[PDB]
């Protein structure tokens, strides 16, 4: 969540030095109108651009009126990816990045 | 792009990535089957490998 009402891009990256390999899980989060968004995220239009050798992905958010589960109507979708050994996962993004 | 049976717009995705052959920008391709007299339009203002 932003700090202070400042959500600064994140740049991190991270080298899979052990040679086994490794699976690196996040998420994007869906929130159920641009209040949400802004309440959480000060940047209204946002993405997660995540990137290693064996892919390319950018993710912008789904804003959409939804059925409460849970008694919450936001969703969240993950992903993975298997980090080979010597290869680094590059972080970017804006908002909306459970990191 | 676009034919008779394609339809496919296509933002570049720019994310900083790993160097693979030394060069760490993507390039992803792809292919369709025009069948005889069909037409494929290509509209790109950007990042098209034509
Ligand atoms: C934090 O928020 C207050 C709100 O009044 C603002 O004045 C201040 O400059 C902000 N900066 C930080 C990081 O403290
Ligand atoms: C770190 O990751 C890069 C790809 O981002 C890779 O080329 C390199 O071999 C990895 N390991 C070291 C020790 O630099
Ligand atoms: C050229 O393509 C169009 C569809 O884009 C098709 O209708 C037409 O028959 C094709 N060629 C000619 C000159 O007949």
Redesign the interface.
Known sequence: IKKNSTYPTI?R?YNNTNQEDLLVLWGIHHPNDAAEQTKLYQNPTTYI?????T????LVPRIATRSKVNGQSGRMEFFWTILKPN??I?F?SNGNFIA
């Open positions: 740049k990256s651009s995540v990137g290693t050798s892919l390319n992905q950018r290869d680094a590059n970017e």
